[PDB]
Amino acid sequence: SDLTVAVVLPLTNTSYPWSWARVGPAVELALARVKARPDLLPGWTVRMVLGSSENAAGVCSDTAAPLAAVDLKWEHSPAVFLGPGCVYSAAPVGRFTAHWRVPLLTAGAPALGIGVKDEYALTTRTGPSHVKLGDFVTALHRRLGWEHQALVLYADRLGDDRPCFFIVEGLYMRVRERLNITVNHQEFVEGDPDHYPKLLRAVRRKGRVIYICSSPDAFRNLMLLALNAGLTGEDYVFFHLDVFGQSLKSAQGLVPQKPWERGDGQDRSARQAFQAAKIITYKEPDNPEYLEFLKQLKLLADKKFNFTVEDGLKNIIPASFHDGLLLYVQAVTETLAQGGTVTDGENITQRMWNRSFQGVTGYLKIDRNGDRDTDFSLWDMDPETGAFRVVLNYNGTSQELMAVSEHKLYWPLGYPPPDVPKCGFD
Amino acid sequence: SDLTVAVVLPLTNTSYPWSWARVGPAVELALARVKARPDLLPGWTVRMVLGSSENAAGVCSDTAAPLAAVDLKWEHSPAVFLGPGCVYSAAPVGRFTAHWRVPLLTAGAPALGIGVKDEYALTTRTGPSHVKLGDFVTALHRRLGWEHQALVLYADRLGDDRPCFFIVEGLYMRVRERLNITVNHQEFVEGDPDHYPKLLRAVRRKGRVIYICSSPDAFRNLMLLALNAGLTGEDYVFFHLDVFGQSLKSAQGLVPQKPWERGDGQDRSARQAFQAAKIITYKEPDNPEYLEFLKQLKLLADKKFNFTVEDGLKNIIPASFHDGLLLYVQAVTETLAQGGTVTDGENITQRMWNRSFQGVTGYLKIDRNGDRDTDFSLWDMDPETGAFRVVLNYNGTSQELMAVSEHKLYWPLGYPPPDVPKCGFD
Amino acid sequence: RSSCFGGRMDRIGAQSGLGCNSFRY
Ligand SMILES: *[C@@H]1O[C@H](CO)[C@@H](O[C@@H]2O[C@H](CO)[C@@H](O[C@H]3O[C@H](CO)[C@@H](O)[C@H](O[C@H]4O[C@H](CO)[C@@H](O)[C@H](O)[C@@H]4O)[C@@H]3O)[C@H](O)[C@H]2NC(C)=O)[C@H](O)[C@H]1NC(C)=O
Ligand SMILES: *[C@@H]1O[C@H](CO)[C@@H](O[C@@H]2O[C@H](CO)[C@@H](O[C@H]3O[C@H](CO)[C@@H](O)[C@H](O[C@H]4O[C@H](CO)[C@@H](O)[C@H](O)[C@@H]4O)[C@@H]3O)[C@H](O)[C@H]2NC(C)=O)[C@H](O)[C@H]1NC(C)=O
Ligand SMILES: *[C@@H]1O[C@H](CO)[C@@H](O[C@@H]2O[C@H](CO)[C@@H](O[C@H]3O[C@H](CO)[C@@H](O)[C@H](O)[C@@H]3O)[C@H](O)[C@H]2NC(C)=O)[C@H](O)[C@H]1NC(C)=O
Ligand SMILES: *[C@@H]1O[C@H](CO)[C@@H](O[C@@H]2O[C@H](CO)[C@@H](O[C@H]3O[C@H](CO)[C@@H](O)[C@H](O)[C@@H]3O)[C@H](O)[C@H]2NC(C)=O)[C@H](O)[C@H]1NC(C)=O
Ligand SMILES: [Cl-]
Ligand SMILES: [Cl-]
Numbered sequence A, B: 001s002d003l004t005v006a007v008v009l010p011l012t013n014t015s016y017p018w019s020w021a022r023v024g025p026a027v028e029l030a031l032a033r034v035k036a037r038p039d040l041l042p043g044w045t046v047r048m049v050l051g052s053s054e055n056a057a058g059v060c061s062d063t064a065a066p067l068a069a070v071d072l073k074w075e076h077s078p079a080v081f082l083g084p085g086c087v088y089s090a091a092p093v094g095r096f097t098a099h100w101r102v103p104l105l106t107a108g109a110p111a112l113g114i115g116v117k118d119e120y121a122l123t124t125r126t127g128p129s130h131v132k133l134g135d136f137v138t139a140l141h142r143r144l145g146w147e148h149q150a151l152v153l154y155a156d157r158l159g160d161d162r163p164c165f166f167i168v169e170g171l172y173m174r175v176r177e178r179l180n181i182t183v184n185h186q187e188f189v190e191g192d193p194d195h196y197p198k199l200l201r202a203v204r205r206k207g208r209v210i211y212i213c214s215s216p217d218a219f220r221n222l223m224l225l226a227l228n229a230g231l232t233g234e235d236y237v238f239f240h241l242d243v244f245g246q247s248l249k250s251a252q253g254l255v256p257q258k259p260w261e262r263g264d265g266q267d268r269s270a271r272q273a274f275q276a277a278k279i280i281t282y283k284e285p286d287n288p289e290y291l292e293f294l295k296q297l298k299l300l301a302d303k304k305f306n307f308t309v310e311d312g313l314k315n316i317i318p319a320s321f322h323d324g325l326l327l328y329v330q331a332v333t334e335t336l337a338q339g340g341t342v343t344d345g346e347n348i349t350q351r352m353w354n355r356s357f358q359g360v361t362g363y364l365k366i367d368r369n370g371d372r373d374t375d376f377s378l379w380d381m382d383p384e385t386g387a388f389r390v391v392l393n394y395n396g397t398s399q400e401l402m403a404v405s406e407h408k409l410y411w412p413l414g415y416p417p418p419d420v421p422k423c424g425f426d
Numbered sequence C: 001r002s003s004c005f006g007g008r009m010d011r012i013g014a015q016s017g018l019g020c021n022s023f024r025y
Helices: A020-035 A064-076 A087-100 A130-142 A163-178 A195-206 A216-228 A267-276 A288-304 A313-336 A345-352 B020-035 B064-076 B087-100 B130-142 B163-178 B195-206 B216-228 B267-276 B288-304 B313-336 B345-352
Strands: A004-009 A047-052 A080-082 A104-106 A123-125 A149-155 A182-188 A209-213 A237-241 A277-282 A355-359 A362-366 A376-381 A388-395 A400-403 B004-009 B047-052 B080-082 B104-106 B123-125 B149-155 B182-188 B209-213 B237-241 B277-282 B355-359 B362-366 B376-381 B388-395 B400-403
Touching (some): A020 A047, A047 A064, A064 A087, A064 B064, A064 B087, A080 A313, A087 A104, A104 A313, A130 A163, A130 A376, A149 A163, A163 A237, A182 A195, A216 A237, A267 A277, A277 A313, A288 A313, A313 A345, A313 A355, A313 A362, B047 B064, B080 B313, B087 B123, B104 B313, B130 B388, B149 B195, B163 B237, B182 B195, B288 B313, B313 B355
Parallel strands (some): A080 A104, A149 A182, B080 B104, B209 B237
Antiparallel strands (some): A355 A362, A376 A388, B277 B376, B388 B400
16 A cells, blocks of 8 residues: 655765765755655555665765665565665665665666666666777777777875776776777875876876776876877877766756866966876766756745755756656556556566666666666867867667767877887787 | 673685684683683683674674674773784774774784884784784895895785785885885786786896795796796795785695695696795794694694694694783783773783783794784795795794705805896896 | 785775786776
């Protein structure tokens, strides 16, 4: 007569894309739409029990989250879990929910190992996956002649969820799975100046197609040093793996888009440097349902959550929680429609998998593995104005690169530089 | 009026040094001695509740063990946890028990990160630690003039607890913490023949003081290939990180000790190869209390556990569980003796830490960090007979290398070869 | 710190190495 949904997310910290101050109103929107739909669980009153994934210091925790999972499981016996979004929170909770035979839904947990559904059974990812980043990088290399060697630099903050590590892990494993080219990698520490001589040296010794996963400022400083050392777009290309567009403003206003601008008198130097730089991000959903969702999310979060949802790519995470929930409610209603129950985890999950769906994020496809295909945008600068804009778009389901608004990929040599230099790297 | 001890170990699988078929009777022995001692918890009837750390396939699980911990915690509210011994089992249980303010005792969990007691609070390790292996390797290098470079090769079976990884991590981190020499490392897969050309090449390109953590047969085959390729004790030394002496028989009988002997007609070749090979193991306890413990352990396991405890270095793990238990019971009695309670986790733990104790393993010292100092033996072959024997002993508390039975460390050149070759590695 | 060693104790962080020197993966 009613459905119990257990939530394990950051209930107090509002810094995460999957924080409850941002996911909570998006989920309330999805529940209010389940009410207004007589074709989705008619009569069931879907209830929600919350559990915080964060520890005493307020960051997401490999300990608070699985404890919360066990506490909600025995206190309420839910039919489905929502979250966590952090990798180290989601891995233990995922293994619990797999063992409990309870479906798990999350728009977080993009790590490679969550994709091993043999272990993380009945885990459905409706947000981005880092293997999907590798699909985009694969398609990018196939469409640009780079079939030999790439270099990946990445850095994290000690004690975080290691987002750049997992980003690089997904790119690295999938790309070598599909292209079998040499992918060199190097970890650094952003605050440690000793690494910058080492990085610049590895930049000019280990690759010319160079992916960097770091903060905006670190990527900016790295570019400034690369120009200062004479590394230009004729030989090198520097991709910034900034999937949430932290180095850019939102796609709603703030025209134009300038990541090299900083106000420290280095901005003229940074623009010349950033001529060799392109930014890889998630794709902003286009459909008008998304913009209407953003308006209702902002209203409902400022209303019943005392939080101000600003514009940006991070909002695709609450939007995907919303969509995943509706995708699940429909799958339950389909299972009920054939004599099943709300606890037929395997039946429900297989209805959700290998299935296309229409949500506020537009067209969303769950693949055979239970993971949402992920679309990416490629930002490039206009050599005239210097501002960055989307020039390429990757459809994750079709794995196609489509040019955007008749733009072209900027190359100082008129075509992309080779992934291997003239007479070897020496 | 009674003490509840929660156990999370392999209750069914008897392949682990910390399996219950072997730790159970040693704990039974320690409880029976608590009864017979009127100075250890007089009147308390120490009860035990068990929880299996293994999953459905019967191997130790990063999921079954923390679930078992939560199940015993709410069903019995124990005052102390015993085990797990697997790293991936012990890490989540350790974080739970740290959060629950309940002391944790184990003779397993030797990984580096368990040592961060800031996180694994009230975790007391009474068995070996892999940082202590780094202490021994440090003292070995200081006493032999190797102050430049070493190479570490290690291999694991996919899906195990990664024992060689954690062994090498402990050695690697501590050795560079104390000596700051260049420690090269390379992982391989034992069953993959592609790696053996790569290993042999890295052996003669990356080091001359060479540590290998692998199975006995892999270490043997690597030696055979090193001789076949002309790598002898005049330039190279190959240490086998065989802490449980898997490549050796027990110290009780089976005279003499021949790890190169296999019965495949290669034995004559293996002996000449093994002239360059030395084996690092844990130290067999000397004291006669240990031998008497072994006799009672064998009797009690064959009695109430239907298990046959064979001789070998692995028996120091049940012996240390035993000793740690008594070391804990005394600490509780001391805490009771000053008005404390059995739940004063921090008071009990600090009485155990930075403390020497006398148990069936002889002299055992808990360091300031809560970890038992670990003694190591160095095995070497007699160039006359070819059999291996202890020639060096390491006292973990005093960090001194003592020669054993007036033996000398065998060198084909009369002294150890330099850790850096003649005119560089080229 | 280390590029390969010291990073947590969950099998989620041992799916590729990626800081490590390995012939597998
Ligand atoms: C990324 O690539 C994906 C892979 O191609 C695209 O998926 C495609 O999405 C379209 C719609 O977005 C979908 O079209 C049809 O889907 C229904 C199932 O086959 C079909 O019944 C529909 O047809 C009906 O409606 C049309 C009018 O719309 C009528 O003319 C018809 O007579 C009929 O009544 C509809 O045409 C594709 O099936 C689907 N392809 C796959 C392989 O799933 C994504 O859209 C694309 N995303 C973006 C943002 O570009
Ligand atoms: C590895 O190195 C460790 C570090 O040195 C050694 O530890 C030492 O262990 C010995 C005994 O095993 C211990 O000796 C004394 O310990 C008591 C505490 O100080 C002290 O009261 C004792 O003295 C009493 O007994 C003797 C007879 O035994 C009498 O003559 C005395 O008058 C007194 O009544 C005892 O002498 C050391 O203190 C201890 N040192 C440290 C720094 O902890 C380990 O034994 C060694 N292990 C091995 C296997 O080599
Ligand atoms: C909300 O979450 C934020 C990110 O998860 C968090 O920011 C970060 O806070 C941590 C403290 O927990 C900082 O780091 C430190 O972590 C350990 C724990 O003390 C220390 O040992 C380390 O040395 C390090 O100093 C991070 O630097 C910081 N990162 C950022 C980007 O701000 C917020 O503090 C959380 N806020 C609340 C109210 O919970
Ligand atoms: C008792 O524990 C033993 C070691 O923990 C275990 O031996 C090992 O068994 C596993 C099977 O669980 C073998 O491996 C495989 O693991 C996964 C899970 O199926 C597979 O996907 C892998 O490809 C791999 O084949 C190990 O190889 C094996 N190792 C050894 C040294 O024997 C015993 O099976 C356990 N016995 C009982 C009764 O529980
Ligand atoms: Cl989370
Ligand atoms: Cl265990």
